[PDB]
């Protein structure tokens, strides 16, 4: 089917009609008659209680609460499906399936199926002509035939689409002259925006969940039972356990900031290296915008650097509570 081919990110509030391929996320699956039971022991999430109708944003963690990844996790045959960073898919998989000797699962990569986004202005009413149902607030999964559509609010509405080669051709050429096209880094540029994280390689094995705050995203059952790194996970949650936090920062720079990189803070005539980015974008309108974790009680008025540049950044205000 192929890569679309790159062309500059927009801010969510000027997005045309967008239609994007998703080459830098992958899908992983877990069937059999232990699924739930197995995924109960090694994320976050209750998976117990899921709906079919559900997807929500899960850690995989270790035994020591540091997140290999955070995961998108849906219902999918007997089991579940879930799409995370291609650049940890391999080794989260490796990790999950250390403890699957003897389960009922069969736990594997699915390269087969093609991940889709579909953004921007008008973006229901343009799908609405292509599918018998779309999903939304009230049915945030909906599946036709081979396809699977994840219903997004934030930052505005978008859709994932999980589908086959020939419904992605469809598509493509049903949208084409009136979608623009893109590729990962528009659906990157979203989940910045929108303060959803992104764990690429370099930050793999680095955070607790809650540095991150994935507790404020509906990832973390602090009721559920059992399952690696919850002691860890649960200590995050004491008064002033975890001083980390995602934010949202833009500004300008000359270069984007990699995933595991630092910033710089001003203080005086000082710059001091603080934070770990996990994901940076550059936008047509020329701002980049940074994901960035750090101390969770940084001054709003805080100025930010990528590493020795002319320019600065600034915190743009979470667009969810922490409290
Ligand atoms: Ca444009
Ligand atoms: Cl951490």
Redesign the pocket.
């Known amino acids: 089917f192929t890569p679309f081919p790159p062309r ?1 990110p ?1 801010a969510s509030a ?1 997005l ?1 009609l967008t239609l994007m391929t998703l080459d830098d996320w992958a899908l992983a699956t877990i069937t059999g008659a232990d699924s739930e039971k197995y995924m109960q022991g090694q994320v976050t999430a209750d998976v117990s209680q899921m709906a079919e109708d559900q997807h929500l944003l899960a850690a995989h963690c270790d035994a020591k609460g540091k997140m290999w990844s955070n995961l998108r996790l849906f219902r999918d045959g007997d089991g579940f499906a879930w799409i995370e960073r291609r650049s940890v898919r391999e080794p989260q998989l490796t990790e999950l399936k250390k403890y699957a000797v003897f389960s009922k699962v069969t736990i594997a990569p699915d390269d087969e199926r093609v991940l889709l986004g579909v953004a921007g202005f008008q973006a229901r009413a343009a799908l609405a002509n292509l599918f018998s149902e779309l999903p939304s607030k009230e049915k945030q999964v909906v599946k036709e035939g081979a396809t699977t559509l994840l219903w997004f609010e934030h930052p505005a509405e978008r859709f994932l689409i999980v589908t086959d080669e020939a419904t992605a051709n469809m598509l493509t050429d049903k949208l084409r002259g009136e979608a ?1 096209l893109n590729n990962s880094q528009q659906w990157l540029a979203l989940n910045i925006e929108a303060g959803f994280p992104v764990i690429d390689a370099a930050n793999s094995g680095q955070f607790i969940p809650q540095a991150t705050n994935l507790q404020a995203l509906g990832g973390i059952s602090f009721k559920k039972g059992c399952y690696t790194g919850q002691e860890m996970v649960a200590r995050a949650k004491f008064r002033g356990a975890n001083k980390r936090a995602l934010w949202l920062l833009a500004g300008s720079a000359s270069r984007l900031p990699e995933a595991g990189e630092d910033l710089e803070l001003k203080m005086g005539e000082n710059w001091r290296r603080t934070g770990t980015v996990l994901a940076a974008v550059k936008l ?1 309108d020329g701002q980049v915008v940074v994901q960035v974790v750090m101390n969770n009680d940084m001054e709003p008025d805080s100025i930010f650097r990528v590493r020795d540049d002319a320019n600065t950044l600034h915190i743009e205000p979470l667009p969810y509570s922490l409290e």
């Open positions: 500059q927009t000027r045309p623009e047509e």
